[PDB]
Amino acid sequence: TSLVSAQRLGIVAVDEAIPLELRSRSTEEEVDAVILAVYRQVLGNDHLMSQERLTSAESLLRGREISVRDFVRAVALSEVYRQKFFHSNPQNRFIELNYKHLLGRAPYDQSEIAFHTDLYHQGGYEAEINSYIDSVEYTENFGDWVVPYFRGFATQRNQKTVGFSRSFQVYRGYATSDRSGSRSRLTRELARNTASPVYAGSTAESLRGTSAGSRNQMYRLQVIQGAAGTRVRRGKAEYLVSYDNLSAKLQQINRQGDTVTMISLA
């Protein structure tokens, strides 16, 4: 997005990112940069140890034996990818990680969760992973030579609006990685076809004045509430409370049977 929304949302680096294309007759440093970009984006910005590097796959990429898409596929099918994104993760979290790493976006629909779940159950991890890389979406956006990059913050064709909002649930910042087993943030949002408010970068903070307590910190409590007292006006509720009233607010939410969806510093 433009700068004025980008600084607020903390997506300036994503907006100014340039797609990396491995051209013909590329030099050694270009292949090095392409390999580094693939490792950064497919492995979700983890500190990749040299012992976890795919030496044979990057050799084939260097020697023009395979394309960038094939190297992306080799990294995605690698046991390193399995260990940090599949073997200790629930299936819904795993496929949103696949969507972020391979297509650069958040899941659009619960049917996309229904897909890749049956596909896993019928054809294994390899077929399920190949679905993303062989998809029509991967071909027009990245092709055989462009490193995949995150696209959820920009308006795409055949895109649902929720994708942009849901993007901030899967991209938590430039200095973030997908490293810690964790559950998806999009489960209820995808299942019930909703959208969650975006609280990223500086968007989450709210005015404090003299209303915040001793340590001048407000917390936003997003809860799901029903009538258990006073009339409930909305199913969704947001509560801004100081630190000193955080335990009391939590306990009275608990005794009303209200489900807490999120707590963030505001």
- For position 35 contacting another protein by CB under 8 A, the verdict is no
d(CA 226, CA 134): 45
Binding mask 87-126 for another protein (x = CB under 8 A): xxxxxxx----------------x---x--xx-xxxxxxx
CB distance 103 to 135 below 8 Å: yes
Which DSSP string do the residues of 34-55 spell out, in sequence order? HHHHHHHHHTTS----GGGS-H
Residue pair 97/44 in contact (Cβ under 8 Å)? The answer is: yes
Question: Among 11, 35, 66, 92, which residue interacts with ligand CYC (rule: CB under 6 A)?
Answer: 92
CA dist 82 and 126 (Å) reads 10
**Shortest distance, position 217 Cβ to ligand CYC, whole Å:** 24
Number of residues that bind another protein (CB under 8 A): 78
154 in contact with ligand CYC (CB under 6 A): yes
Measured from the CB atom, the residue of 104 and 212 that comes closer to another protein is 104
Out of 18, 25, 29, 47, the residue judged to bind ligand CYC by CB under 6 A: 47
Question: Residue 204, interface with ligand CYC (CB under 6 A)?
Answer: no
Q: How far is the CB of 128 from ligand CYC (least distance, A)?
A: 10
Shortest CB 204 distance to ligand CYC, Å: 18
Find which of ligand CYC, another protein, none residue 74 binds, CB within 5 to 8 Å per kind: another protein
Give the nearer residue to ligand CYC in terms of CB position, either 154 or 237. Answer: 154
* Cβ atoms within 10 Å of 163's Cβ, excluding its own: 21
Question: What's the rounded Cα separation, in Å, for the pair 76 and 210?
Answer: 51
> What residues have CB less than 8 Å from 131, skipping those under 6 apart?
115, 116, 119
Does 25 bind ligand CYC (CB under 6 A)? Our answer is no
Structure tokens at 22: 């491995």
Structure-token pair, residue 24: 């013909």
Residue 36 binding another protein, by CB under 8 A: yes
Those residues whose C-beta lies under 8 Å from the C-beta of residue 153, and which sit 6 or more positions away, are 1, 9, 11, 14, 15, 164, 167, 171
Q: Is 184 left (phi over 0), alpha (psi -120 to 50) or beta?
A: beta
Taking each continuous run of H as one helix and of E as one strand, the counts in the chain are 13, 3
CB of residue 180 to another protein, shortest distance in Å:
11
- Token pair recorded at residue 188: 């209820």
Closest contact distance (angstroms) between CB of 65 and ligand CYC is 6
Q: Which is nearer to another protein, 18 or 207 (CB)?
A: 18
Q: Does 86 bind another protein (CB under 8 A)?
A: yes
Structure token digits, residue 20: 């990396």
Stretch 177-216 residues interacting with another protein (CB under 8 A): 181, 183-184, 187-188, 190-192
- Residues of this chain that bind ligand CYC (CB under 6 A): 1-2, 4-5, 45-47, 56, 59-60, 62-63, 65, 91-92, 113-114, 117, 120, 154-155, 159-161, 164, 174-177, 179
